[PDB]
Design a protein around this ligand. Structure first.
Ligand code: 0LI
Ligand code: 0LI
Lengths: 279, 281
């Protein structure tokens, strides 16, 4: 009702970004708003395009109902014979995944920025869980966490199974994913790197194994290392009932975040952008 | 479509403004764990004025418009909840020279660019929204000094053809751009428009007759980047003839090349400098 319908011909300079499941994510410039945008457009040459339409409108309805500071903001729908899609704000600094694992482009990612990111992911998911009815994400991974021009988090949805809790091979799924993500953020390692076949991963996890917690994985200089290890281990407990709520997580995190002097967040970000611009 | 937030979910309320439509207070939402602003004012008609405002803000979601988070609608309490903007208004940034003694040029242009992006979006809605009360007091600044447009001495932002009220003045499509020109002059000078004249009727008369804030070396110093493109923009914007004034879409197009000369890192640096001086001074 409030959601603009954007004609395809109003979208200029389309550049590919991703080929997600049903179709492509591209960057563009809106000709009248003069801002950059992202657009997710499904393929037109499918026999199952009838249901494709339905999926797109259901997705836009969701994103629109879920407006919030840490959820990717939707700007409109494209709905024409030649072109079907969702338009959102464009996040110039890509995904958390890239931030963590492109060590040539991002050789230092200061601790405060990392805790901010974890705090904001929690704020986002928590808001979804507090909607009426609750929205459950059920596909959290670092690929789905986007970062705006100041490296604030925008949660989205588009190596799969590592973020999945064993009992899904549920109100307690997102928090499992968030624990792995947390391990991932503090370590900058791929969970289960030295492990080829993902069936072996599902088995190991079935049996209670988790990413390794180590001097090698989580070095001893991590601020609040021990509070954070507790959070991770609660979060990915074999028993879903031992895993905490996101609200409990935020409460555990708030004092950790209060330790950082506010200027240090901006300093962490300015450093990153400076190094990124030189790669 | 828009959450209804119970008053008892809002913790630690602290006064901020006693604006037009009610009191504006800061608070913390007990379940979302974020800070918020809340504007709280017949059970027939008072509601409609608030519900009409929330409908507007909700219809107008965009990067540079103040984001509405919900409505409070209870027997004890009626209001609108929005995101909270910790760095106050553009007005404070410009005129509190003790707290903010240097405001680097690039940050200033970014702000101007973003005000234009906001008003432009309003003008492009269906039907168009017209602001008609732009001033520096209504431009808010988020944690990284990005702009959020809002609405809550005054006549200086008003174009002369709106002095005589009516159905002409209301449907004027060229009001916001006049206000934006004065704001622009204000941002580049950090002077009050018409500081020298005591009585605001003499201001209305002078403006009736084509006079505008003074442009020169004292008001707009020679070191302003793109001084001459910017003076042109201001002057087209506040032209006596409404038809010579540009659309905000034209405005943005005139600005885009100016903004492109600043390396993007420079905006963040300007913001760091502010926060450092605000803290160390
Ligand atoms: C164009 C576009 C369209 C849609 C979506 C999208 O995220 N849709 C979405 C669907 C569902 C949900 C919640 N559910 C999860 C599943 N489900 C079981 C529950 C409900 C959410 C969430 F935000 F709420 F999480 C989002 C993102 C983009 C993007 C983009 C973009 C912007 N900058 C860049 C830079 C690089 C790459 N991409 N990119
Ligand atoms: C709680 C709250 C509620 C509402 C509004 C509000 O701005 N409502 C609004 C009404 C109409 C319009 C557009 N129209 C203009 C007239 N009109 C003829 C056309 C339509 C717009 C606009 F933004 F779109 F302009 C906004 C702001 C606040 C705030 C706040 C806040 C947050 N942090 C701080 C820090 C210090 C002080 N305040 N504060």
């Amino acid at each position: 009702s409030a959601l603009p319908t954007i004609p395809y011909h109003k979208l200029a300079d389309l550049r590919y970004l991703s080929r997600g499941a049903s179709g492509t994510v591209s960057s563009a410039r809106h000709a009248d708003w003069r801002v950059q945008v992202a657009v997710k457009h499904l393929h037109i040459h499918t026999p199952l395009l009838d249901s494709e339409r339905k999926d797109v409108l259901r997705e836009a309805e969701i994103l629109h109902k879920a407006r919030f500071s840490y959820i990717l903001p939707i700007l409109g729908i494209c709905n024409e014979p030649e072109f079907l899609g969702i338009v959102t704000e464009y996040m110039p600094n890509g995904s958390l995944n890239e931030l963590l694992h492109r060590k040539t482009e991002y050789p230092d990612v200061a601790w405060p920025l990392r805790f901010r990111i974890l705090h904001e992911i929690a704020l986002g998911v928590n808001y979804l869980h507090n909607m009426t009815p609750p929205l459950l994400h059920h596909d959290l991974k670092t690929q789905n966490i986007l970062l705006d021009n100041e490296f604030h988090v925008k949660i989205a949805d588009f190596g799969t199974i590592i973020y999945m809790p064993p009992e899904n091979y549920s109100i307690k799924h997102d928090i499992y994913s968030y624990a792995v993500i947390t391990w991932e953020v503090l370590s900058r390692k791929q969970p289960f790197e030295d492990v080829t076949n993902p069936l072996q991963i599902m088995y190991s996890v079935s049996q209670g194994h988790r990413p390794v917690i180590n001097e090698e994985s989580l070095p001893y200089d991590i601020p609040h290392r021990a509070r954070m290890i507790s959070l991770i281990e609660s979060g990915w407990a074999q028993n879903p009932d031992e895993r905490p709520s996101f609200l409990k997580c935020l409460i555990e995190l708030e004092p950790v975040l209060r330790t950082f002097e506010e200027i240090t967040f901006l300093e962490a970000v300015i450093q990153l952008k400076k190094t990124k611009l030189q790669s």
